[PDB]
Write an enzyme that holds these catalytic residues in place. Structure first.
Site, mmCIF file in Angstrom:
data_model
loop_
_atom_site.group_PDB
_atom_site.id
_atom_site.type_symbol
_atom_site.label_atom_id
_atom_site.label_comp_id
_atom_site.label_asym_id
_atom_site.label_seq_id
_atom_site.Cartn_x
_atom_site.Cartn_y
_atom_site.Cartn_z
ATOM 1 N N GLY B 19 0.885 -1.122 -0.304
ATOM 2 C CA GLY B 19 0.365 -0.032 -0.026
ATOM 3 C C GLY B 19 0.934 1.108 0.260
ATOM 4 O O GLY B 19 0.641 2.168 -0.778
ATOM 5 N N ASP B 20 1.518 1.591 1.445
ATOM 6 C CA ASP B 20 1.875 2.529 1.709
ATOM 7 C C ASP B 20 3.138 3.223 1.639
ATOM 8 O O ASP B 20 4.040 3.897 1.743
ATOM 9 C CB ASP B 20 1.802 3.474 2.399
ATOM 10 C CG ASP B 20 -0.462 4.115 2.578
ATOM 11 O OD1 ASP B 20 -0.629 4.885 1.794
ATOM 12 O OD2 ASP B 20 -0.992 4.373 4.125
#
Ligand SMILES: [Ca+2]
Ligand SMILES: [Ca+2]
Ligand SMILES: [Ca+2]
Ligand SMILES: [Ca+2]
Lengths: 152, 153
Positions: B19-20
Site C-alpha cells: 500500500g504505502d
DNA sequence: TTAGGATCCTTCAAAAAAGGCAGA
DNA sequence: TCTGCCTTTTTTGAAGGATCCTAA
C-alpha cells in the site's frame, strides 16, 4: 456469509490500512423520510495499471466490483449485508482503520431502527461524523448538523 | 545476528508496504567513490505525521531504521545493508505488488562486494537498479545505468 | 421510498526520487 | 573512500468525499 482465510485477512488488513478507505456519508435527498440517506462504502484505490490487483480482490472477497475512472480504479463494496460480513471478518486485523470499521458495523446494525425515529436517525448521523473525523476528511459538506435541520 | 520476524507481523506489514511503502534503488553521483557513483538501497514507509506513532512502532518491531519528518508527512527508512537484506528476505514471500523490487534489492545487495571491483559488473548491477525503477511508479529519476556508462571516460 | 450504482471532484498523503554531511 | 544518517523536491496515486439515476 463467506469465511475468509486468516493469512488473506492479515495481508488485506495491511493493504486496506494503506490504500483503502472506509467511508460514511449523509446525502441530502427529498424523497427519503428524513430528507437524507446514509451511504456506507468500503473502497480500495489503485492506479489503473494495477487494476488487475483489484479484479483479483473481487474474486477473493467474492462480492463488490471495480470501476475505472481513467487514471485510477477503485474496488467498491457498498451493499449493506455483504459489507457487514466482510468488515466483521476484516476488523480484528486493522490498525489504522479499525475504529472506522467498527463504527460502520454499529451503524449498519442500527439502520432498521434509524428508519423509524428522527432522534435515532440523528444519532446514527453523529457516528457518521465520527468516521469522517477519523479519516483524513477534506471535502465533506453534509454532517449531522445539516440534518439537525429536521428541526421542523 | 539476523532478527527473526513473526509471521502475522510480516503478513500485515507486506500488505501495508504494498500500500504505502516503497522499495527504492538509486545510483547517486559522487566523485569520491570508486566508479564515481554510490549505490543506495532503501525500504521506506510513508505516513501523515499525525500517524507517526505507527512508523515509530516499525522501528521497534523491525529493530533497526529510523523515522524522519518532512513537511506534513513522516517516513520510516531502512537503508543499512545487512539488516535490510535480512528483513526483505523474510518479507518478500508475502508481498504481491512489490515482490519483484524486493527480490531485485536482495540480488543487488548480494552482488555489492563484486560490484566494487569491475566497471562491467558495476554497470550490470546498475541495470538491476534500472529494473526496480521501471517496476516502481518512477517520475523524477535522473541518474540511470546509462549515466554511469560514462565510465567510458 | 429505499438501496445500490454511476460519475465525477477536491486535495492531499503518499511514493519515488533528488541531494548533502561528517566520522572512521 | 565508504556508509550510514540526514533533508528537500516532484508529481502523482490515492483517499475521501460530492451528487444524479433508477429498479425494486
Ligand atoms: Ca495511506
Ligand atoms: Ca481526521
Ligand atoms: Ca499505494
Ligand atoms: Ca513503472
Amino acid at each position: 456469509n463467506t469465511k475468509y482465510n486468516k493469512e488473506f485477512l492479515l495481508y488485506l488488513a495491511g493493504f486496506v490500512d494503506g490504500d483503502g478507505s472506509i467511508i460514511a456519508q449523509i446525502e441530502p435527498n427529498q424523497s427519503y423520510k428524513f430528507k437524507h440517506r446514509l451511504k456506507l462504502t468500503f473502497k480500495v484505490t489503485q492506479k489503473t495499471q494495477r487494476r488487475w490487483f483489484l479484479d483479483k480482490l473481487v474474486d477473493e472477497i467474492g462480492v463488490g466490483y471495480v470501476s475505472d475512472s481513467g487514471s485510477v480504479s477503485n474496488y467498491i463494496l457498498s451493499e449493506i449485508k455483504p459489507l457487514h460480513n466482510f468488515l466483521t471478518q476484516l476488523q480484528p486485523f486493522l490498525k489504522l482503520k479499525q475504529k472506522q470499521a467498527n463504527l460502520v458495523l454499529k451503524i449498519i446494525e442500527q439502520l432498521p431502527s434509524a428508519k423509524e425515529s428522527p432522534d435515532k436517525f440523528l444519532e446514527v448521523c453523529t457516528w457518521v461524523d465520527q468516521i469522517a473525523a477519523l479519516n483524513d476528511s477534506k471535502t465533506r459538506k453534509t454532517t449531522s448538523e445539516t440534518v439537525r435541520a429536521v428541526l421542523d
